[PDB]
C-alpha cells in the first residue's frame, strides 16, 4: 500500500503481531506470533498459521513472552515474514514504527533498533510504548490505560502525553491464562479439553461466548436455578456442547486471580494501585479517563464491571469514566498509524544517519 514516503506500523504482541501501513484505519495483517522450526532437519522456518498447521513436525516457539522479546533470532523471522510475506514491501524503502511494552529493558530497546537498521536496512525507525499509543488513539493525552493481551496486562498512568514509569504495574494474568482456565472448567463440567487442538477450540469459545458478570455472586445463582442463559457451541466435528456458568467464571479470573491459584490483585485493584502511586493532583483525571485496550478487554460486560469496582474503591464523589472503544483490540496499532501519519512526525524518527553516528543507544534519547 503507499503518500510521499509510506511509513509502516508493526505492533508486536505475545500472541499476535498486527502490521500495516501508516494512514490506514486498521492493521492489514494480523497473525500469530509463533515461529516453527524442524524437529529434525530442513535453517528453515515457518511463521504464524502455517507454523501452527505444521505443528506435528515443527518445534513451535513464541519469541515474545509477557510482552518482552526473549528470542531475537525468532523475532527476526517474525519481522522478515511481516515485511515480505504479509505486507509485501522492501523494508529498506520505508520508515518503520514499532511498539514495545511498558518498562521494556534498556538492552531490548537497543537490539530492536540495531536489528531494524543493520538487518533490514530501514531508512528510519521509531519505538513507541503500546499503552501510550492506545491513549492517543482514544483522543486523550492524560488517563490510565489498562492494556490486556494474550501474555501480559499493564496499568499505565499517563500525563500530558507521557507514561509515569514509577506508577506502572504489570500483571502476568492475561488471555492465555483465561483460555487455559476455560479448558479446566469446561472439563470439570463433564467435557474433555486438554490438547493443543482443543486449546484452539477453547480459545474460540472464550472469544465467542464468555462475558464478565456485573454481580458475580448473583450470576452463579441465576445459573444455578435457571437454564435460560446457557449457550450451545458447535465443535469442528458437528458435536454440540452446552456452556453454562463457565461463560462468566472464565473472565472472572481477571477480577479474582485466586481462581487461577494466583496471589495477585485483580485488574480493578491494580488500576486503583497505579492511580494511588501518582501525584494526588492528577488522580481525578486518571479516574475520569480509564481506557481499556487489548484483546483480553473485549469481553462483554467488562467496562461496566470495571466502573462498578473502581467506584467501590474510590471516594463516592469521584467521577469515574471507563472508555472501551469497539476497536480496542487494535487501539495500539491505530494510535501508531495516526502518530506516524502526522506532518510533524518527520522530525521524530531515528534516521539511518543518526544510527550510523551514535549506534543503538540513540533510542534512549529519541524514543521516550
Amino acid at each position: 500500500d503507499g503518500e510521499d514516503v509510506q511509513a509502516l506500523v508493526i505492533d508486536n504482541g505475545s500472541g499476535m503481531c498486527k502490521a500495516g501501513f501508516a494512514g490506514d484505519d486498521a492493521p492489514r495483517a494480523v497473525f500469530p506470533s509463533i515461529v516453527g522450526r524442524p524437529r529434525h532437519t530442513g535453517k528453515d522456518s515457518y511463521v504464524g498459521d502455517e507454523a501452527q498447521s505444521k505443528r506435528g513436525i515443527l518445534t513451535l516457539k513464541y519469541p515474545i513472552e509477557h510482552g518482552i522479546v526473549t528470542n531475537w533470532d525468532d523475532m527476526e523471522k517474525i519481522w522478515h515474514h511481516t515485511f515480505y510475506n504479509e505486507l509485501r514491501v522492501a523494508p529498506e524503502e520505508h520508515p518503520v514504527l514499532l511498539t514495545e511494552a511498558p518498562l521494556n529493558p534498556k538492552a531490548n530497546r537497543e537490539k530492536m533498533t540495531q536489528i531494524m537498521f543493520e538487518t533490514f536496512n530501514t531508512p528510519a525507525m521509531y519505538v513507541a510504548i503500546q499503552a501510550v499509543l492506545s491513549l492517543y488513539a482514544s483522543g486523550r493525552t492524560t488517563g490510565i490505560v489498562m492494556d490486556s493481551g494474550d501474555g501480559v496486562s499493564h496499568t499505565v498512568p499517563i500525563y500530558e502525553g507521557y507514561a509515569l514509569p514509577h506508577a506502572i504495574l504489570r500483571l502476568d494474568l492475561a488471555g492465555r491464562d483465561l483460555t487455559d482456565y476455560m479448558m479446566k472448567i469446561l472439563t470439570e463440567r463433564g467435557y474433555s479439553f486438554t490438547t493443543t487442538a482443543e486449546r484452539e477450540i477453547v480459545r474460540d469459545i472464550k472469544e465467542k461466548l464468555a462475558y464478565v458478570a456485573l454481580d458475580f455472586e448473583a450470576e452463579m445463582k441465576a445459573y444455578a436455578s435457571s437454564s435460560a442463559l446457557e449457550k450451545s457451541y458447535e465443535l469442528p466435528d458437528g458435536q454440540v456442547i452446552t456452556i453454562g456458568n463457565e461463560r462468566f467464571r472464565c473472565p472472572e479470573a481477571l477480577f479474582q486471580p485466586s481462581f487461577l491459584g494466583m496471589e495477585s490483585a485483580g485488574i480493578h485493584e491494580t488500576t486503583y494501585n497505579s492511580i494511588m502511586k501518582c501525584d494526588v493532583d492528577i488522580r481525578k483525571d486518571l479516574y475520569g479517563n480509564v481506557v481499556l485496550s487489548g484483546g483480553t478487554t473485549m469481553f462483554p460486560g467488562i467496562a461496566d464491571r470495571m466502573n462498578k469496582e473502581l467506584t467501590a474503591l474510590a471516594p463516592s464523589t469521584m467521577k469515574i469514566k471507563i472508555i472501551a472503544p469497539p476497536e480496542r483490540k487494535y487501539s495500539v496499532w491505530i494510535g501508531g498509524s495516526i502518530l506516524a501519519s502526522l506532518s510533524t512526525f518527520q522530525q521524530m524518527w531515528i534516521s539511518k544517519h543518526e544510527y550510523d553516528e551514535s549506534g543503538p543507544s540513540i533510542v534512549h534519547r529519541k524514543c521516550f
Binding site: 494512514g23 493525552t141 500530558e160 502525553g161 502518530l339 501519519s341 502526522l342 534519547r365
Partner: protein, 127 residues
C-alpha cells in the same frame, strides 16, 4: 539526534498574548482564518492556544484540544498528539485540556467573547 518540530505553525505559536486556533486537516495542523474564530465544525477537531501575558515578562499557555461529536478517530488522535508536541515545543510550559463538544470548561468557553457556535460538517478524514 534532536527531535525538533520544524512545522511553520510551531514557529508562530505563543509568540504574543492572544488566542490562536488551528484545525486538524488530514494529519496536518492548519491555521483557522481569524474571522472564523468561535465557529467550530462538529465533524472536526481543533487545537487552541491561549497565551496570557504574565507580570513576569514570560507568557502563560493553556492548550485545549476540542473534539467535535462527529470528528473522525484520526482527527481526535492527531489533535491530542499535536497538543503534546506543541507543549513539548513550548518547553513543557503549557497546561493541556481536553474539550468535548457540549462539555467544554468555562475557561475555554470564556475565550469567545461573542459566544462559541457549533456548525455541522467539516473536513474529511485523513485515513
Amino acid at each position: 539526534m534532536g527531535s525538533v518540530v520544524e512545522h511553520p505553525e510551531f514557529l508562530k505559536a505563543g509568540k504574543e498574548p492572544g488566542l490562536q486556533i488551528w484545525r486538524v486537516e488530514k494529519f496536518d495542523l492548519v491555521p483557522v482564518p481569524t474571522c472564523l474564530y468561535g465557529d467550530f465544525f462538529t465533524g472536526d477537531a481543533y487545537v487552541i492556544l491561549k497565551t496570557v501575558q504574565l507580570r513576569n515578562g514570560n507568557l502563560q499557555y493553556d492548550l485545549h484540544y476540542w473534539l467535535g461529536n462527529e470528528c473522525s478517530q484520526d482527527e481526535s488522535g492527531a489533535a491530542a498528539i499535536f497538543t503534546v508536541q506543541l507543549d513539548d515545543y513550548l518547553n513543557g510550559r503549557a497546561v493541556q485540556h481536553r474539550e468535548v463538544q457540549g462539555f467544554e470548561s468555562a475557561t475555554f468557553l470564556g475565550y469567545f467573547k461573542s459566544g462559541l457556535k457549533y456548525k455541522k460538517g467539516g473536513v474529511a478524514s485523513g485515513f
